[PDB]
Every structure is written in structure tokens, then in C-alpha cells.
């Protein structure tokens, strides 16, 4: 049961420093290499480098050389990716990888997405989105939840406390001024709206704001 | 161990300094065709100082 357990995803700001812990388990630690692979949030696996497990000697890819510290703690078998002078590029899911070496890397840190950026936690601005005549498709009147300008992700956007997942497409939260907008679309029959309450319920644990917005017609 | 490495006594560096030229000079070759010869040729007759 070899498992690479890393640190958790960590929100950071530029100019800072982050050290991602990776504890290795299920195997004699010294006997493999220990690799790091940057997976950029949208980009495929970009291999950060590796540190010697026995010697503790790091080596980095040309891009990863000089900003990054591969460090090990022998006894508890904890590999470390440390990123110094944090930069927005340092936001990504990072993976320690136990080397089977020339045979690649067998196993993987559960992932740590560092998030490096300035903003401060901000609540969502949530809009019950009332459809118009052009928004009624067949039986279904599509309804919407416009979540606006929150940091950080997530907001938990349900519909009538999640009783509607059915016509619900909650669309990915994306960046605005380092704040986030997800727009959730519940698709409900015109028989259920506005006859039944359809209320998008937006819970933002980071800003501790649970925002319930009921869509009523314009 | 004090500098960057978990092992003593050795290392490696690749020192790249961008070269540029402060001041450069040039040699040039003559084509014998482009050679001239300017021959002042005179004969002494009645003359003055000027």
C-alpha cells in the first residue's frame, strides 16, 4: 500500500514561500527516487525534478532550478517541495512522485494545489437570475444563479438546498479581479416556476457566507 | 553543507557571461586594380619661384 501523502492545497500570496510536505508510506523510503511534477491548473504534467531519497540531494528541471527546494526528512519519510518567492505561476496542483526511476514514477502525492495570489477572502454577490420570455425552453423555464465577486473558491451553490440537482448545471467558478463567479443554471419546468420556489443557495465557507437567492419573475 | 549541497568537497558550475564588444577594429585588403600611381612629372624650362 505505497501511498504518497502530501500537504493540503494551500492559498498563498506572491512574494511568499511555500513548502509542500509529502510524506511517503508503504515502502522503505530510502530505496526509490522522489520526484516532483508540476501540473499547472490547466496544463499537463510538467516535471519539477527529483531529490535523492538516500542522499537527500535535490536536482531540478531547468525551469524549476533555483526557485524551488526539494528537501527530505529521512525518518518519517517526508519529501518536501518548497517553493520560494511565491508567484502566481506557483499556483498549481503539485505532485511528489515515488521514483521507479527509469521505469518512471509509480505512485503519486494525493496532490497539493498551491494558490499564489494577492486577494483577500470576499463573499459572493449572488443574483437570483430571473428568466425572460426568451429563456423559456419547452416545459422548462431555465433559471440561474449568478454568483459574483467572491474570494476564495468555493462557494457551494445548491438549488432549494440542493433538492434541485436535476436541471442544475452549476458552471465553473472563474476569476474576476481575483474574485470568483460561478453561474449555476437549474433547468425547471414552467409548471414548477414561478409556481414552486426555485432558490439557488450559495454557501461560501471561506467568507462564511451562505447566500440563498430565490428566482422570481421579472 | 554550508553552501547548497548535502555533500562535501566538490560541485559544478556553468558560468555564462554574455559577450559583447566594447571596441572592434578592422583590417582590409587592397585589390591591385584599385591601386593607382600618381606620378608628378615635370621638365625644367624657363621657370620662376612660383
CB A19 within 8 A of CB A32: no
Q: For residues A29 and A31, give the distance between their C-alpha atoms in angstroms, rounded to a whole number.
A: 6
Residue A55 touches chain B, beta carbons under 8 Å: yes
Residue B13 touches chain A, beta carbons under 8 Å: no
**Which technique was the structure solved with, according to the deposited record?**
cryo-EM
From A52, which residue of chain B is nearest by alpha-carbon distance? B6
Half-sphere exposure of B27 (CA within 13 A, CB side): 1
Interface touch A55/B5, C-beta < 8 Å: no
Q: What are phi and psi of A91, to 5 degrees?
A: -80, 115
Give the minimum alpha-carbon distance from A98 to chain B in angstroms, rounded to a whole number: 20
Architecture of the A119-215 domain: Sandwich (2.60)
Domain coordinates in residue numbering, chain A = 1-118, 119-215
What Rg value do the Cα atoms of chain A yield, rounded? 22
> Which H or E run contains A93?
strand A92-101
Resolution to 1 decimal place, in Å: 4.6
Continuous H helices in A50-203:
none
Q: Which residues fall within 8 angstroms of residue A205, CB to CB, at 6 or more apart?
A: A154, A156
Residue whose C-alpha cell is 568537497: B9
Half-sphere exposure of A184 (CA within 13 A, CB side): 32
Neighbouring-strand partners of residue A112 = A94
State the cell numbers at B5: 549541497
Residue A62 touches chain B, beta carbons under 8 Å: no
Q: Provide the CA A117 distance to its chain's centre, in angstroms.
A: 14
Q: Is the bond into A194 cis (omega within 30 degrees of 0)? A: yes
CB A179 within 8 A of CB A151: yes
Amino acid at each position: 500500500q505505497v501511498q504518497l501523502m502530501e500537504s493540503g492545497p494551500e492559498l498563498k500570496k506572491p512574494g511568499e514561500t511555500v513548502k509542500i510536505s509529502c510524506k511517503a508510506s508503504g515502502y522503505t523510503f530510502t530505496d526509490y527516487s522522489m520526484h516532483w511534477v508540476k501540473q499547472a491548473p490547466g496544463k499537463g504534467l510538467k516535471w519539477m525534478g527529483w531529490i535523492n531519497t538516500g542522499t537527500g540531494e535535490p536536482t531540478f528541471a531547468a525551469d524549476f532550478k533555483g526557485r524551488f527546494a526539494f528537501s527530505l526528512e529521512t525518518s518519517a519519510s517526508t519529501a518536501y517541495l518548497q517553493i520560494n518567492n511565491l508567484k502566481n505561476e506557483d499556483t498549481a496542483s503539485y505532485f511528489c512522485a515515488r521514483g521507479v526511476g527509469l521505469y518512471g514514477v509509480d505512485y503519486w502525492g494525493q496532490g497539493t494545489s498551491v494558490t499564489v495570489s494577492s486577494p483577500k477572502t470576499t463573499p459572493p454577490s449572488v443574483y437570483p437570475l430571473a428568466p425572460v420570455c426568451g429563456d423559456t425552453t419547452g416545459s422548462m423555464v431555465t433559471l440561474g444563479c449568478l454568483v459574483k465577486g467572491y474570494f476564495p473558491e468555493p462557494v457551494t451553490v445548491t438549488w432549494n438546498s440542493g433538492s434541485l440537482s436535476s436541471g442544475v448545471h452549476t458552471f465553473p467558478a472563474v476569476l474576476q479581479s481575483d474574485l470568483y463567479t460561478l453561474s449555476s443554471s437549474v433547468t425547471v419546468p414552467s409548471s414548477t416556476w414561478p409556481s414552486e420556489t426555485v432558490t439557488c443557495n450559495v454557501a461560501h465557507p471561506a467568507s462564511s457566507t451562505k447566500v440563498d437567492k430565490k428566482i422570481v419573475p421579472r | 553543507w554550508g553552501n547548497g549541497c548535502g555533500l562535501f568537497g566538490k560541485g559544478s558550475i556553468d558560468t555564462c557571461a554574455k559577450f559583447s564588444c566594447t571596441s572592434k577594429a578592422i583590417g582590409r585588403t587592397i585589390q591591385p586594380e584599385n591601386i593607382k600611381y600618381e606620378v608628378g612629372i615635370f621638365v625644367h624650362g624657363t621657370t620662376t619661384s612660383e
